[PDB]
Symmetry: D2
Subunit: 336 residues, 4 copies
């Protein structure tokens, strides 16, 4: 009916209990600490809601109908806009001094952010691998959770992640067919050709040739399926070789109509990874200003180990001159 009832403000606005006050020593700034976290958690719930809806669109086959790509990209863009706000939101907690935090910090133990169910659900559903987590005090992340919460966390690890669902979709990208546009075949040939030409051309001058060799190494390593499988097992890469080919197809042919919105999707996945890392960085800096080894553990989380779509960033390494890219003639254009 009424605003307050529709938003269940009877719950939202009766959820602030200062432990400092419960123990007979109310500290003003504890209220800000509570509200800040409650606001983070409301937005985490919203991100989960968007992300779960996008996972469902992939898992139920709806993504196959390309009419649904706009909704997919809008919701992923919305996740990024929320994360941007969450990064800015640290500026509020920076109005609390370490001295004032020090007056109520004692009443917090043994509570910790490590116990944020939703933050973990979000990491898992995007596709952070448990085996790839940095241990804190030689402990498992789920050790802090019990009951239905531990159950929910397990489901989040076992259900298909955003990374896995995107991977599957990337594997079906049009153009990879050897009997068709044969993208991979043509790309290998064109680059090999071009490098040899560069070889002849070059045949400080000499160190320029030295640089050429480095590029040759990098570019050719792309066609090494085994090296990929090895790096996959480590966890230094995350996407299947075939998904990687699909992604590169979308990068190079981004302007082709069928690939325009898919390209935007890839861009937004990278954005989410970057913003997640920015959130972790801002959080680290705050612990440092307040507590003066959590700080070092948190710093370790600011790493490629926690970047789920690292493969999408790394495709910049394999940029080539435009004229080496297999031409998409109107003859072939039809499929795109």
């Amino acid at each position: 009916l009424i605003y307050g009832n529709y938003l269940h403000l009877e719950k939202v606005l009766n959820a602030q209990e200062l432990q400092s006050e419960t123990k007979g020593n109310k500290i003003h700034d504890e209220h800000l600490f509570i509200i800040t976290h409650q606001a983070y958690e409301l937005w985490f719930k919203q991100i989960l809601w968007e992300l779960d809806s996008v996972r469902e669109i992939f898992q139920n086959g709806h993504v196959r109908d390309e009419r649904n790509m706009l909704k997919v990209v809008s919701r992923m863009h919305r996740v990024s806009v929320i994360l941007k706000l969450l990064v800015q939101q640290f500026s509020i907690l920076e109005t609390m001094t370490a001295l004032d935090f020090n007056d109520f910090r004692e009443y917090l133990s043994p509570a910790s952010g490590f116990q944020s169910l939703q933050f973990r659900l979000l990491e898992n559903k995007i596709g952070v691998l448990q085996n790839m987590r940095v241990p804190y005090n030689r402990r498992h992340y789920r050790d802090n959770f019990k009951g239905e919460e531990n159950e929910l966390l397990l489901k989040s690890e076992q259900e298909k992640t955003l990374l896995e669902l995107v991977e599957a979709w990337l594997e079906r990208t049009p153009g990879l067919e050897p009997h068709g546009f044969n993208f991979w075949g043509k790309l290998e040939k064109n680059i090999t050709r071009g490098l040899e030409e560069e070889f002849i051309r070059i045949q400080e001058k000499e160190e320029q040739v030295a640089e050429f060799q480095k590029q040759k190494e990098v570019l050719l390593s792309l066609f090494d399926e085994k090296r990929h499988e090895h790096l996959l097992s480590k966890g230094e890469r995350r996407l299947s070789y075939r998904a990687l080919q699909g992604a590169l197809m979308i990068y190079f042919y981004r302007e082709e109509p069928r690939f325009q919105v898919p390209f935007q999707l890839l861009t937004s996945l990278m954005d989410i990874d970057s913003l997640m890392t920015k959130w972790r960085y801002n959080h680290v800096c705050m612990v440092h200003r307040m507590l003066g080894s959590g700080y070092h553990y948190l710093r370790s989380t600011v790493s490629d180990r926690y970047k789920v779509f690292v493969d999408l960033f790394n495709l910049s390494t394999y940029l080539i001159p435009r004229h080496w890219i297999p031409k998409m003639n109107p003859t072939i254009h039809k499929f795109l």
Copy 2:
């Protein structure tokens, strides 16, 4: 003590019920609409908490001890940092299209943002006067409220506002005493002299339109500057609600502006700055809200546009002191002679 229990997430995260889904027609974006408003309301509660603490510091006399000024200005600064975030937060709801909003809008009636208790408490506690409010549907804002909420709103109108508490503190500003530094007396004299000196320079300037323009400016400025010493004009503008602060409080504020670098006035000057910031940010919030209603409902909108005005700027008198700026050399000299009182 576990995170979720300390933050009472059992309440906060079980407070999201889509009306579209309750009526068997779940619309995805209704969830965003709910969360966005819940986040606004959490932050309004935080602003009320800071603002109530500052009101108390004034009302109970603690502000008299100047050691408390840092805390006062930090909390007022913190309110403006929150408001800045609340302005940016509109960007989230701008990811909802009007078409998608149109799919669940029917399930909202009869709820409205108009019915935000906390938003009204915030306006009232800052110092929005009821008699100065633009009518909605040719009726008073409080009619949209009933029961304990209507009663709380009345208390919020009758209890001392931030404007009134700052006013009383401004009235006691050191320097105004006729038997002391006699700021107002000296300021009137120095401006009178300064204007005269200016006139002499102007009349000598060769007959020309440029001179003519300078003459025009001089007359305008003369009018403005001298009008400052007209206590009757002030009382008149107070009754029409075009000004808000007592004449004496205005004198205190101007004292702080001109002598802001003097140690006792440094943090008071920051307080005045922060009060203006809060007014400006409140206005920016109202502007962004208007633009969004327009993008969703098309061309309520007109009432909201009417709220974007000086009628809702409680500390308008602090902004308007820019009108009465004079060259630095006209400002009464303090000097070591009478420097140590500040």
Copy 3:
């Protein structure tokens, strides 16, 4: 090639002369005032560069190849990202107090922001109409300029605006053909039918305040929705400048709104969204500028003229916003269906 030479820093970083210092009374904050404006002007030059490139893609027919829509939308999105930064940039100038501004203001006369060539070029190229400009002190804007600057401004007024180039492209939107999908014909019929059905339902209620309230709302809605099919009212509102797009372009825009998820319309829909964003951000820039003039100069005028610029009179793509007025239940939208689906499948 050195950084400083590539960026011509010998020019950029030797362009700061304080007039207060030239007249023997250096005021520290004047430096901030100079740099802030120089930074605004660099970004205005960048906006003109993006906007000119997009205008050209339309004017030369490149937009007809839908491969170029990604570039169009990325550049329009980039303009909005810049404008958002320019709005935030006011926060720097708010660290200057009015008292400190008052110490060097005298040395500025008779220079004014009104003399920003690039800001005028930007307004003109987007599509602000001269007739719809608020007069300042009963004077025309362009007489503040002379020589080549006056000439550049005239070209900007006479060349095709972004609004006109988008209009032309909207007129060619697939689906409007009476002998084809016949969007307009089907939309008129569906809404007429829908309204009739609605009326019957309400008519069948018992006489009450509630019934009459519903009747009243129905009549309001009916008038709005049906007014859309009145080409003559549209022509009339065009001449008063309350609308800007041709009737046919309006039909194209509504086609893109309703069928946004169809593949050929996905990126076009994003373009329309970005055009609305640019108008909103331009207006936000104007609003933040007004608030600052007030904080520095006080009320009384400049403040009042600038406030008048914050109005729909300066919103070029007002017709895109106002399509929210004509939202209808989803089930009244003519079905696209596989039958004709392909015409919007790339």
Copy 4:
């Protein structure tokens, strides 16, 4: 008289954009954005140098001794942090350039590099980045990328008093440290020693349990930390390794201001300390955002050097952050009753 464009020297600022891609007959649209973005960074670096130089001068010439000048000091330092915040947000503009599009004009840039930003180096030096602390790139000194007057300017920047040194000297003179006066350090050592003793008694009184044992463990850690503060030799040692930067006495002054921040004479000094930390944090955020962007454009040498810059070795006021380590219960802080308080009253 004076016209906007002349006042701002726009004839220089807006004729400073030459695309190397275009000079070599292969114009690439996005190179223009690359140029403008850097030019805008450089304008704001010039503004930060202007504010920072003015504040350095206020310290170096003794003006800071008159506490009337503290408001101007804190406003200008706050203004530096508001600019830096904008500079961090400004990366969002260059993120609208894709790596593919950057790849089309990158070849025309060699051998120019950001490393060659005079102003960025001047800024690092004037704040107080010490040369010995700098990470070498390709086993070279940073200044060897510079020649002529530029090399000379950089040398002056290294030799003149840094903000770190000027703040250090001012912190050493903080009221309250005098053994013959309030004797802050003497009283603080005694109160902490007493407090630790009291704490030990409380814990040892607890009933045998692991929690007690944990509290014992915590106590022993905290005791060592807090008492290590009174070890001037440990401080000298940490200074040599560059893990601390401030003199022992300056550290005492800083802690005095932290604990007595509400006392009137220390209110604005406390804000100054806060602002110095803000600048360091924002400088490191700038370096972080720059790293992330190099990676997204070039992929994963430079990247690793730049990552090494995102470190406490480039935080000049790291000591101000680290004072959080030495927080004690409020009741242990030496009492300042109005009697003694008199010395800290305007």
